[PDB]
Paper text:
Chitin is sensed in V. cholerae by the hybrid histidine kinase ChiS. In response to chitin, ChiS activates the expression of the chitin utilization program. Previous work from our group demonstrated that ChiS is a noncanonical hybrid histidine kinase that contains a DBD at its C terminus.
Here, we present the crystal structure of the ChiS DBD at a resolution of 1.28 Å. Since no structures for close sequence homologs were available in the Protein Data Bank (PDB) to serve as search models for molecular replacement, we used the single-wavelength anomalous dispersion (SAD) technique to determine initial phases. The crystal diffracted to 1.28 Å resolution and belonged to the orthogonal C2221 space group with unit cell parameters of a = 51.91 Å, b = 78.61 Å, c = 72.37 Å, and α = β = γ = 90.00°. The structure includes 105 of 106 residues of the protein (1024 to 1128), two uncleavable residues of the purification tag, four sulfate ions (SO42−), one 2-(2-hydroxyethyloxy)ethanol molecule (PEG), two formic acid molecules (FMT), and 200 water molecules (HOH). The structure of the ChiS DBD revealed that it contains a fold that is reminiscent of the canonical helix-turn-helix (HTH) used by diverse DNA-binding proteins. Specifically, these residues were located in the β-sheet of the helix-sheet-helix (R1068), helix 3 (R1074, K1078), and helix 1 (R1090, R1092).
Numbering used by the authors:
A (entry chain A), B (entry chain A): 1022 to 1128
Write the structure that this text describes.
Amino acid sequence: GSSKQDLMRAVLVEAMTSALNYWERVSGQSKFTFAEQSGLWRVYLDRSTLQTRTLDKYLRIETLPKTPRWRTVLNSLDYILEHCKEAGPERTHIEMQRDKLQKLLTS
Amino acid sequence: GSSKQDLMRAVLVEAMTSALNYWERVSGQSKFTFAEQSGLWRVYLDRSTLQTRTLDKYLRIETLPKTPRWRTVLNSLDYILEHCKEAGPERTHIEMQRDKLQKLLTS
């Protein structure tokens, strides 16, 4: 129902933002670099500056697309966890949010 | 010194035992299957029965070899975490023990 759909969207934003913050700290690379190196998100020239325009929409519930690319988000969480291994609460939180999303998508 | 060497051996046994218990529960497969499918540990015919004779020595501090194969143990932890994703305290403990071993080996 509407509650499950809104929960999925809230978890997707939490998971993506958490994963990017972890990527930035552990890899020492930018959000731009995650998109460019993984090939999972496109780079655009906006306001005369390179931007991960679509990825950026997934970092706030207000801008999340009407049709989220759930598999691309799960591939993003997997890519970040594949390249960033530092064990700890921050990583555990991303793993837990990944499992939550997967269970919501398959229930 | 002796303290660091004994700590490394104690952490190796904790990590291996933890990882195998997690593999068995999450994969629903045996220790034998972890060895056979990964190819990381040999199978032997002892007492007329198939056994992971060398791997078994890593599950008790009393039997741990004088010369542990540290890389084979780290490859074992990586293989189990690659195939078993269930997020939770049990998985976090294995990740934490893996990081502890790596830091001891590089300090």
